[PDB]
């Protein structure tokens, strides 16, 4: 029924938590990620030996910093999370550039997307939100959506699980009409605000939610159990 899901780590204490995250038996299939700033690239590389675990990289744009991050054997990135867009002026196409191209690269791709406060409060939720998976769309082909990953956050204390499941569920019919119901069936879609152990729990069981991007810290953990 659903896709294979994702718990992903988004850093923005290291040591101890690496020793942790590989002294922790993960019973279910799941993808779990761990995304790193270029200047801690290489300790979280060398330590975290976790086999069902993966590094990312985080907001590369430019084409040969793409390459050396393969050859370094990096594989993942995260793009677009809010603050790329809210304080250092990422805007909707420079996001959708920066995951065609990661792409083009042999990179899997989680491409962040999400209305702030006064956006919700006015009722411009799915406008806003669809927006920019469509700018996303645009440079990407149908073929490409193997290799992406959606996470919902919102810039907006938790959404209770109705409030994620609305926008989760928006999308998703989105992407069904627009880019096709096999795509939309096989797509993994991220909760990106909120999550600690017990909420994480009860909002993945909700019918269009395949997983989190969270904080990286201990509570992690318990947030990967919560992905069944």
Same mark, same amino acid.
């Given at each position: 029924?659903?896709?294979?899901?994702?718990?992903?780590?988004?850093?923005?204490?290291?040591?101890?938590?690496?020793?942790?995250?590989?002294?922790?038996?993960?019973?279910?299939? &799941?993808?779990?990620? /761990? #995304? =790193?700033? %270029?200047?801690?690239? $290489?300790?979280?590389? *060398?330590? +975290?030996?976790?086999?069902?675990?993966?590094?990312?990289?985080?907001?590369?744009?430019?084409?040969?910093?793409?390459?050396?991050?393969?050859?370094?054997?990096?594989?993942?990135?995260?793009?677009?999370?809010?603050?790329?867009?809210?304080?250092?002026?990422?805007?909707?196409?420079?996001?959708?550039?920066? &995951?065609?191209?990661? /792409? #083009? =690269?042999? %990179?899997?791709?989680? $491409?962040?997307?999400? *209305?702030? +406060?006064?956006?919700?409060?006015?009722?411009?939720?799915?406008?806003?939100?669809?927006?920019?998976?469509?700018?996303?769309?645009?440079?990407?082909?149908?073929?490409?959506?193997?290799?992406?990953?959606?996470?919902?956050?919102?810039?907006?204390?938790?959404?209770?699980?109705?409030?994620?499941?609305?926008?989760?569920?928006?999308?998703?019919?989105?992407?069904?009409?627009?880019?096709?119901?096999?795509?939309?069936?096989?797509?993994?879609?991220?909760?990106?605000?909120?999550?600690?152990?017990?909420?994480?729990?009860?909002?993945?069981?909700?019918?269009?939610?395949?997983?989190?991007?969270?904080?990286?810290?201990?509570?992690?953990?318990?947030?990967?159990?919560?992905?069944?």
């Amino acid at each position: 029924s659903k896709p294979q899901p994702i718990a992903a780590a988004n850093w923005k204490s290291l040591s101890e938590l690496i020793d942790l995250f590989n002294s922790t038996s993960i019973n279910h299939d &799941v993808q779990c990620v /761990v #995304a =790193s700033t %270029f200047v801690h690239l $290489a300790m979280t590389k *060398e330590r +975290l030996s976790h086999p069902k675990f993966v590094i990312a990289a985080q907001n590369a744009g430019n084409a040969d910093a793409l390459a050396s991050l393969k050859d370094f054997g990096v594989n993942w990135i995260v793009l677009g999370h809010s603050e790329r867009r809210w304080y250092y002026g990422e805007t909707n196409e420079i996001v959708a550039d920066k &995951v065609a191209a990661a /792409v #083009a =690269s042999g %990179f899997m791709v989680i $491409a962040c997307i999400g *209305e702030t +406060l006064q956006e919700r409060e006015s009722g411009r939720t799915a406008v806003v939100v669809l927006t920019q998976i469509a700018a996303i769309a645009k440079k990407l082909k149908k073929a490409d959506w193997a290799k992406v990953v959606i996470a919902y956050e919102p810039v907006w204390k938790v959404a209770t699980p109705q409030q994620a499941q609305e926008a989760h569920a928006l999308i998703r019919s989105w992407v069904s009409s627009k880019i096709g119901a096999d795509v939309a069936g096989e797509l993994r879609i991220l909760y990106g605000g909120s999550v600690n152990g017990k909420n994480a729990r009860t909002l993945y069981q909700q019918r269009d939610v395949n997983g989190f991007l969270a904080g990286l810290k201990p509570e992690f953990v318990d947030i990967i159990k919560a992905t069944q």
